[PDB]
């Protein structure tokens, strides 16, 4: 109650503003949260403020995974997929059109009762002719 007036940017114990490298998102807090820091492969997208957390993306050659970019995952080329042992070319039959994710099998045109209008590649799916 006394504290509910301590506004965002501060905590209560007496409304001391947030320490360095600390923030408070709303008024009323009995403490400020420590700021995420963007280290190694994580680059700073938005600096920490007294009322907002730091935001991180990834250095070029990596890309963000997870809610709020909790992980940086190495890129590969179209026609590859990342593995526990690095970028591998797509096996014949499979394609990746992005710098992330897995090689996916070509479409089976026979199944939907159609011919392969155009052959696939390690970057593009086949195209079927109805």
């Amino acid at each position: 109650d006394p504290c509910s007036n301590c506004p965002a940017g501060t905590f209560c114990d007496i409304c001391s503003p947030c320490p360095p490298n600390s923030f408070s998102s709303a008024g009323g807090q009995r403490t400020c949260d420590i700021c995420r820091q963007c280290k190694g492969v994580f680059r700073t997208r938005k600096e920490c403020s007294s009322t907002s957390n730091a935001e991180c993306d990834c250095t070029p050659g990596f890309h963000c995974l997870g809610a709020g970019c909790s992980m940086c995952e190495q890129d590969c080329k179209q026609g590859q997929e990342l593995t526990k042992k690095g970028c591998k070319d797509c096996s014949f039959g499979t394609f990746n059109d992005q710098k992330r994710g897995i090689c996916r099998p070509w479409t089976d045109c026979s199944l939907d009762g159609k011919s392969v209008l155009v052959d696939g590649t390690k970057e593009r799916d086949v195209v079927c002719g109805p």
């Binding site: 280290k39 970019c69 992980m71 940086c72």
Partner: peptide, 15 residues
């Protein structure tokens, strides 16, 4: 998904 290592880094603030 691949394991955390030299190809994928986890920010332990988040993780």
């Amino acid at each position: 998904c691949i394991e955390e290592g030299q190809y994928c880094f986890a920010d332990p603030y988040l993780c």
